Amino acid sequence: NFIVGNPWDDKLIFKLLSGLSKPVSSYPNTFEWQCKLPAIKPKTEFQLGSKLVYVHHLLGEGAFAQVYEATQQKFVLKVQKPANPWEFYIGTQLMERLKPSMQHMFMKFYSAHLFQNGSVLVGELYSYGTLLNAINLYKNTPEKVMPQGLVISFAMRMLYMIEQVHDCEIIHGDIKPDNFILGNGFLEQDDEDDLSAGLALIDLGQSIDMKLFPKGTIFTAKCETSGFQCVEMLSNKPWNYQIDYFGVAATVYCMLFGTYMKVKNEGGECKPEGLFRRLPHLDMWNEFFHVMLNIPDCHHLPSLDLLRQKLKKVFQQHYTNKIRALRNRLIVLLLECKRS
Numbered sequence: 001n002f003i004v005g006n007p008w009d010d011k012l013i014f015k016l017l018s019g020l021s022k023p024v025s026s027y028p029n030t031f032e033w034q035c036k037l038p039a040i041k042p043k044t045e046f047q048l049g050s051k052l053v054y055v056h057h058l059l060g061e062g063a064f065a066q067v068y069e070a071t072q073q074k075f076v077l078k079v080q081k082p083a084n085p086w087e088f089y090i091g092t093q094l095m096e097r098l099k100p101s102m103q104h105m106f107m108k109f110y111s112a113h114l115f116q117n118g119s120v121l122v123g124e125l126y127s128y129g130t131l132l133n134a135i136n137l138y139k140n141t142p143e144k145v146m147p148q149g150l151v152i153s154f155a156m157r158m159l160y161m162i163e164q165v166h167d168c169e170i171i172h173g174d175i176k177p178d179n180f181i182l183g184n185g186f187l188e189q190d191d192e193d194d195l196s197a198g199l200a201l202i203d204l205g206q207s208i209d210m211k212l213f214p215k216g217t218i219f220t221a222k223c224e225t226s227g228f229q230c231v232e233m234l235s236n237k238p239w240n241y242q243i244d245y246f247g248v249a250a251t252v253y254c255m256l257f258g259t260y261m262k263v264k265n266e267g268g269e270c271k272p273e274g275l276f277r278r279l280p281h282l283d284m285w286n287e288f289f290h291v292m293l294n295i296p297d298c299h300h301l302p303s304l305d306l307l308r309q310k311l312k313k314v315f316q317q318h319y320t321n322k323i324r325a326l327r328n329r330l331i332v333l334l335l336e337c338k339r340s
């Protein structure tokens, strides 16, 4: 039952990276440049060490990075100061541990460029915006919120995704609507029963590799670097994989209400704010959040498969017929937003 205070500490990360049989530098894709980070701005040109690259526009920004669209087929550039070789390590590892079939669920990194004061990562592109953006689009519409059938559908894919990541003994560490993105697969999704298509997960900067740590290690940090806090962090309790369970539930809560989840303690259990009576499938959602939020300990993680089945049951009873229309409607909204 080993203990590590902070898994996101820079000193710790440098120690793990430095203490590797296969340094990141060893990878073929990675490149180390002595010079400072090049000036990168939309509608400009610069050479990525060797070949010239054209940046068309800024797709999105986070607390750590700015992501631009680039060409010469289109891809993206993830720029951040200081350098973040860690993301490349995690991304590289993840594709290696994953089954080849499941790689399309996550962003692939083609190459990494490490500068003196920053890093630039070249990665796959997803052109139809984040899950958060999609949630915001509905607010303008009459429904004001995502249809349940799409919520449930997106939810089951998420549970399926973290299951694959956790099998790799990896923790995402930052599961939010901002870090979910919509790509072509969502557009071309033809098989509803296939959970591998229509949703992709990104932002591996805050990810944790459990392989590097002893068996049964635990973390006691009371918040994630951006300040993201799960239930264990609030309760001063230890945690490892629970943070991703909490993240999925927070992301699903957002699809349901279009507002970030807030937590409260009622009786002996932890519950989210405002699960009102008129909410469809209220029983199912109460059960879903109860399990995802109230985990007794690190050794009793809820079955991701079981949760998925409970949602699948409700989906098969009420939304198999209506799903195509709901997806088409969303597709039109995504196209409209992308036109802007």
Ligand SMILES: Nc1ncnc2c1ncn2[C@@H]1O[C@H](COP(=O)(O)OP(=O)(O)O)[C@@H](O)[C@H]1O
Residues within 6 Å of the ligand: 059, 060, 061, 062, 063, 064, 065, 066, 067, 076, 078, 107, 123, 124, 125, 126, 127, 129, 130, 178, 179, 181, 202, 203, 204, 205
């Ligand atoms: N592959 C991608 N395609 C399109 N946009 C992306 C891609 N990756 C990231 N983004 C955009 O970048 C923003 C944040 O990127 P992320 O990787 O989460 O960086 P950070 O760690 O700083 O949050 C997102 O809101 C998203 O719009």
Ligand SMILES: [Mg+2]
Residues within 6 Å of the ligand: 062, 063, 178, 179, 203
């Ligand atoms: Mg992010």
